Design goal:
- The structure is cut from a larger assembly and holds four copies of chain A.
- Chain A is α/β, with parallel strands linked by helices.
- Chain A folds into two domains: 1-245, Type I PLP-dependent aspartate aminotransferase-like (Major domain) (Aspartate Aminotransferase, domain 2, 3-Layer(aba) Sandwich), CATH 3.40.640; 246-363, Aspartate Aminotransferase, domain 1 (Alpha-Beta Complex).
- Helix content of chain A is 36%, strand content 16%.
- Chain A is built from twelve helices and twelve strands.
- Chain A has helices at residues 3-9, 50-63, 74-82, 99-109, 124-130, 153-162, 213-226, 232-243, 245-264, 283-289, 307-312, 349-360, and strands at 67-71, 89-94, 114-119, 135-140, 166-170, 188-192, 206-210, 269-273, 296-301, 318-319, 329-331, 339-343.
- In chain A, the strands form two sheets. Chain A has a seven-stranded mixed β-sheet with strand order 1-7-6-5-4-2-3, sandwiched between helices.
- In chain A, helix 2 (50-63) packs parallel to helix 8 (232-243).
- The termini of chain A are far apart.
- At the A-B interface, helix 3, helix 4, helix 7, helix 8 and helix 11 of A face helix 3, helix 4, helix 8, helix 9 and helix 12 of B.
- Chain B: GO terms for molecular function: cystathionine gamma-lyase activity; cystathionine gamma-synthase activity; pyridoxal phosphate binding.
- Chain B: One of its GO terms (cellular component) is cytoplasm.
- Chain B: It holds the Pfam family Cys_Met_Meta_PP.
Amino acid sequence: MRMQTKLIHGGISEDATTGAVSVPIYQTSTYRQDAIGRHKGYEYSRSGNPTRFALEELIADLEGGVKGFAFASGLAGIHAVFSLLQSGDHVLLGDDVYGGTFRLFNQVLVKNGLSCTIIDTSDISQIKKAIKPNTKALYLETPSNPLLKITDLAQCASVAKDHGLLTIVDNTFATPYYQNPLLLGADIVAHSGTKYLGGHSDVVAGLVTTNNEALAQEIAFFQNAIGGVLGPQDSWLLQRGIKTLGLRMEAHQKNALCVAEFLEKHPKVERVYYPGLPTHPNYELAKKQMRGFSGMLSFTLKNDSEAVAFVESLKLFILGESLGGVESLVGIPAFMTGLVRLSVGIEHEQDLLEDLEQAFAKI
Amino acid sequence: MRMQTKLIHGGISEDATTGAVSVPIYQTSTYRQDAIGGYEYSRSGNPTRFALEELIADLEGGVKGFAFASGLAGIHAVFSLLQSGDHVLLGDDVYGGTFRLFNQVLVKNGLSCTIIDTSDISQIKKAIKPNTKALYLETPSNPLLKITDLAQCASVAKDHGLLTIVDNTFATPYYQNPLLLGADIVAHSGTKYLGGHSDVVAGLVTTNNEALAQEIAFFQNAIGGVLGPQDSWLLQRGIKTLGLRMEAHQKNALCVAEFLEKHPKVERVYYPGLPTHPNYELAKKQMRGFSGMLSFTLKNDSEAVAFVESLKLFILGESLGGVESLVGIPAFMTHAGIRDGLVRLSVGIEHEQDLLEDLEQAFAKI
Amino acid sequence: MRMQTKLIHGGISEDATTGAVSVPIYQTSTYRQDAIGGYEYSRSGNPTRFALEELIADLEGGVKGFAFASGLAGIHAVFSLLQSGDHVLLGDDVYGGTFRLFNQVLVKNGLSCTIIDTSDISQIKKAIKPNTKALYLETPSNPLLKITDLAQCASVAKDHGLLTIVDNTFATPYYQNPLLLGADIVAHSGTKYLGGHSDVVAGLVTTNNEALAQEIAFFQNAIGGVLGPQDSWLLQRGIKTLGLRMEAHQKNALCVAEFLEKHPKVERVYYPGLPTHPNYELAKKQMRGFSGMLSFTLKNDSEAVAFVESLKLFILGESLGGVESLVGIPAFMAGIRDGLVRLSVGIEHEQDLLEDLEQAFAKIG
Amino acid sequence: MRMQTKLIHGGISEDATTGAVSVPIYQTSTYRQDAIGRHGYEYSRSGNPTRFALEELIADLEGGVKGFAFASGLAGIHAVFSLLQSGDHVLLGDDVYGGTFRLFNQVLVKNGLSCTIIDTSDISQIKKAIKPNTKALYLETPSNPLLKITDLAQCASVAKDHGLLTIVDNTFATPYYQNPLLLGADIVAHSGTKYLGGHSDVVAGLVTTNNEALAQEIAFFQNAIGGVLGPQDSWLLQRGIKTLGLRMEAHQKNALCVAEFLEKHPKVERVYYPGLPTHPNYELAKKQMRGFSGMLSFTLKNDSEAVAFVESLKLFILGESLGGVESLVGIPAFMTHACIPKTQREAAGIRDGLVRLSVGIEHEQDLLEDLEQAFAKI
């Protein structure tokens, strides 16, 4: 079965006992057991839950892993991933990773004996040079946010492997529909389900999956030990949202192209950051490792002062703080995470252009 | 507003714009701004979650409330307040998962702990180091229901540089308020009595202190182990009957304890409400009642499994604090005074007679 | 919402319950509670004061605002964050009372300072000590209108562990917004351009930073140098015409600068709006306009007092930033010659202002 | 009116009096007049409706106030330089096409003017070379045969900040992919002979301008020197222009297929094409250009084999010109730059292994098969 068919029938997508084409929401905390040391499969909802498990199975099935793990948020998942390491360990970050991941290290992890080194990861040599005797992981994120900066996954993975290093990839922007880091040498993949996977701006969730059984034992342990689990209703809604991913990602791509092209041939606009443009640095690398480009695009205007007047005069893009939803979103990462980030939604392309038009006419 | 009225109308229990007597569920990740510069992003804040947070703050007399994906998610973020190189003092019978947090997650993140009997006040004195930054209390204890003087402990804690953190899961806010007794931070598993219907996994933390509130607020948002709006809403709904439930829990538990103690095959009963309990007077002092938690040791240890496996009403299972009665053997589940034969009962709200008849029939099988 | 609009509907410009287009004046000291557990005590919080604080936060791009009994009391509270044995860099011509605050108040409390020319970015680099915590800028500067590059000094301070503190009184939030140029704390003497009507003594402070906001709040409350409700309200009221007043101030100040410059009897003229002014290109870049503040030194230095005492429209007085024209010799009230005349150009008719100057010049040698 | 529509309806594209959807060919030397002092045509060296129609079109297409049609690309360039007085100085591109270099070297130099060859991508080199009597800067982008890109906006700005005029040769990128008058240039020159005609069947020059006074000046020397384009060739140039949009779309697509083929090839070294992301100033190229033409050049590894390669080509026509519907091939080192000593050639970046292609509008596959077999023989 193909990706499109897997989004609908993958993992667990059916109640085995009733035939329900939808996995039931197990709003429960505990489970009755036959004799002690002989359970019915589930013991306690923090450790495992049939609804959450179905979702965890789905994301594993999609990214080509052995196990999935659903979390209360993207950050909670990432946090649990880094709980695999001791104090005295080192991690190499990309120079433009998501701000909350930076704050995770800066303010939570570093504090606990975990050191990081920020480097440009599209500069393969900057990673070669940055490894210390205690470096235990390489944390990549491509396309990056904002700026959509592409990193070479297979290369970095190869390089991380001949050193005793973990390749941990944040696949949020380019979904499992467009990119599968585990098939390119990654050990652990993390998403914000809060974004595209959910895709209706109505769930806060993180998903992690892995290629490695030993890694999976570890991640499980810390999901259970720290307990930042995804609830069953959210799990169910995430899975429901995931069902449409393919169609949504297609529509996201189609729209964001029209938007990028229109923006590039504009008098008010200077540079434009989108992976689908032949004009974007490493465009070739992208077509190599991505089956498509999402709906994210940063960009800048020649007049750097108007940035805030432009964003605030738009009437169809929602001025808000997330991305990856069916509604188009807009931000300015200066005060949020003269650069303007667009999360192109799945509204009619013309209405999106007409909305950008009228907001340009105003500056 | 008294406790029993507060449970229903406390924190935010109403929708202000619409008038709705229930808080609406905000299944939403992000909010439109008229910005740039109330709500911005659901991990940082959410109206459903907030209403519950205000509720629990209101019930414990804290300045802020914090809702987590699980009890443990809450405790974890509480200990994220500390730097590597810091020292923590622990109870010798703290909940199994709390001990595992330190042993498996927090020690390897550079924190050190020391296990002392918290009912022994001089043991806490003797165990204090220069890097000791906090004392962690759980009373009554899981699973032996051991009682610890909260005023005394917080007193000794306060006149060193120490934080007094209390897990108040067993007594809930209906029967004990550690903040009003000198504690700095209070943590619950909302999965237990607060939800009460064994259908939600949830943590709740609250604090006396405005600055401490900012720190927890920081690590709630930064680590991101937040309760979802649906679970927040359901947990709030559960809390509305907390008062009535705890009374039934206490009435039944009292009845059961007095049955088990008078029973031929039983050796000791651990229940704070039994006059013969170590620190029974101290319980009456710091608690407005005892919950539904008790455990007992049966004269012949080898019969504990067979006893537990032949109960027909009590559900053999992992958790506690629900309307349905639960039973476990701590030795083989959640995990000094703990013998393989120890049996822990979570007395639910069924008919006292239905619960007694169940135990009667199970003893007849050993 | 644009700045011109924001001055009228920003922060809180309306009573929520009643719909009043003006914030009501809460002449109250205390509030009934349904406690134990919004407003508790007027020193901690007052709805009127808060309205003004929200407005300034909103104007400067801050997260919180803070209203004080005076510009000084605010500056005081800002520096109250620092421990003893800490170090601070000061502009060589910061406000006379800002020096006297450090010189005589904060020093004896264990604080240390170094006077530097801040328009010399290399000079600040030369003065950083290991115990230095903050740089304090003031541009344009009293009374020479010396301009400092906010963006660079912020950067230089940012890559060290330093706090950028800016006194934005002169070029108001309408012309300059330090917080967007990498500043951490902005402070105003509300007594000046913000009130605009020479009838309120006030100080306003705002910040980019949550943790700094917690701190400033703490010290505003603990020292208690808070602004009253009536003064807050009058201040907010004043702020509503800020945009209109600043435009007229500039239009007049440029008109006067060009008169004084082309004048035989005048030596130098200090005004950021003059092309031939140190760092004029810098002014244009970080400021959206030049204000009503200008100074000038005349050729006959001893005849400075005779000039000032013969002005009929301009008022010889002790302040600035009002709708009426003010004049003072900053020496009587390092650049400052005992014949430097400082002009606070009001919003009166320029012809009337120029005709007051003509007649004053026409009485000295 | 979008550009694609302008090519069909722009300037004068209709006979107002008869209805004709084609401008009539005016094979006439003269016109009857109504009375003395009262013409709107007098003599066809000054004015002719057929040529004027095409002239309007090129002004319209390039955003100029007036168009000028000349007997050839050179005639047009020459008429432009006929503005400057004896004594004047000109900054010239080093990659400038033969004819234009020679125009100065062997015609304009002996007539008072004088030049300096400078690289125009390197903007400081222009600044360093401005003399007090310098009055003009002549740019060609993309260039021949290496396709160097040049910043039109900034080069036009630096020239305007001095006393200078900006003259751009917009032949390669057509008015369909580039519009220098809209980037601060004052005069635009084309070889109509090339892409504008499109069918390798007309020799013609086109010049247009922003400036009312420059328009007057160019009109004068057009009429005074008489290097005017004839009415039949004007008409054919206009006819070819009607399909410029389409032809350029096909050229670009075909050129890109070939570009990508060539650089994936083991026997090739550098590929010079502005439409490759790997190309120098590809960034700038995208900003000022709306598309890349059919012109590419490539060097093969074994320098000497370029000859054997070209001789086996059976679809690419070995020929001097460019910008036609048919695909053309040449070796600049021999076809156009044999007079320049091989070492100066290599300095200028022109090796004996540099082959140039004017990719036509044949089926991209056939063109690829053609290159495939030719490579196979070496």
